[PDB]
């Protein structure tokens, strides 16, 4: 049985980055050559694993995380990076074992006058731990005065919209991201390439 990579890569709609999606993959045969030999992806960088060995490796579980960001932020989806997306939305671990796949989606995720479905967290008083997902909407207290849950001066709503317009520069255009995580536990590996089946 193959792995349902099409559900993740070829999904109709993607999640906002602050509420990034995660799909568990197990008990299937994966064909990573379909992905590395695609040229549809502008970004395909692996960490802690080498890409050409993937078809000959097994793992206990593979997690695919999917979300949308803008072009200038694709570089933040890497270990050790900082910035608004890596600090407040989606953080990779320093010891990351997996791959980061991205591609431009300006045609799917833009609307004339702005597509506002895709949001990001702009304010947070602490950085995320790796793979932490914060979907709360508390008012962010920028000063010393309690905000009482009321938006206002020094009391920011923490989320903001990308507002993807098809006329934005490539840096401000939507990019779909899929992060694969290769997890190897003391348990029978169930996700293998075609060669290790």
């Amino acid at each position: 049985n193959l792995c349902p990579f099409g559900e993740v890569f070829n999904a109709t709609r993607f999640a906002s980055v602050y509420a990034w999606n995660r799909k568990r993959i197990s008990n299937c045969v994966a064909d990573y050559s379909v992905l590395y030999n695609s040229a549809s992806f502008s970004t395909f960088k692996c960490y802690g694993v080498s890409p050409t060995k993937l078809n000959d490796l097994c793992f206990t579980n593979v997690y695919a995380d999917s979300f949308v960001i803008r072009g200038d932020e694709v570089r933040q989806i890497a270990p050790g990076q900082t910035g608004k997306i890596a600090d407040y939305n989606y953080k990779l671990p320093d010891d990351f074992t997996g791959c980061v796949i991205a591609w431009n989606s300006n045609n799917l995720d833009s609307k004339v006058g702005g597509n506002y479905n895709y949001l990001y967290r702009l304010f947070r008083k602490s950085n995320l731990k790796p793979f932490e997902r914060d979907i709360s909407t508390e008012i962010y207290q920028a000063g010393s005065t309690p905000c009482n849950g009321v938006e206002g001066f020094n009391c920011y709503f923490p989320l903001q919209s990308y507002g993807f317009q098809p006329t934005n520069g490539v840096g401000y255009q939507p990019y779909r991201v899929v992060v694969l995580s290769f997890e190897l536990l003391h348990a029978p590996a169930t996700v293998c390439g075609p060669k290790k089946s």
Partner: antibody
Amino acid sequence: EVQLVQSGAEVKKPGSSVKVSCKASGGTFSSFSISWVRQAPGQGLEWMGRIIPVLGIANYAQEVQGRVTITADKSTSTAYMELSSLRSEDTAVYFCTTDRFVEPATGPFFDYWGQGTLVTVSS
Amino acid sequence: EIVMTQSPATLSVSPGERATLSCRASQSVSSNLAWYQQKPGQAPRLLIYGASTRATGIPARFSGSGSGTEFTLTISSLQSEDFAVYYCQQYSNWLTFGGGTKVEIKR
């Protein structure tokens, strides 16, 4: 671009409630959020609240919290403002607005406005 | 809080003249400053955002300038329709409206 058409004027008794509608004639609002701004006769503009339709979350100003409910039906491209426990001080014109934000500034400015809805409260 | 002060409350200028309206912020709002025009009996409309960027369809005789705490709205040749109330509004740290300037016909 965006055309905002509001419901008609209302004469209401104290203690009652009113619900004002605001329809985007384009089939969409094309904004992150939609605010309601009120103006008492001869006075300036006071922000009351906004709804973020994507999240279904509404933020209200302190002066009306508990008395006001802002909603948005995505199917009909219509925002609503329901003010209750009406007092005579609520006599004002109420405008709906599409909000626009410029990162990293945290405030909205209002690039499109409905025509306004007069709400007279009197015994 | 950011306090927005408009001066003067009433600006009496004759038709076809230049009009200059002042908006002062009690602390810096950078260029996150908007101007609205409210004609009699009508809803406000956006004239300027970003301190100096005209909203779409706004004619070039309206222009804004300033950054920080001192802003101005200039009308290069007053037209009968331009006699109205004008509001500035910061949106740097949430929002604050100015009190309004009435551009009145000087006679």
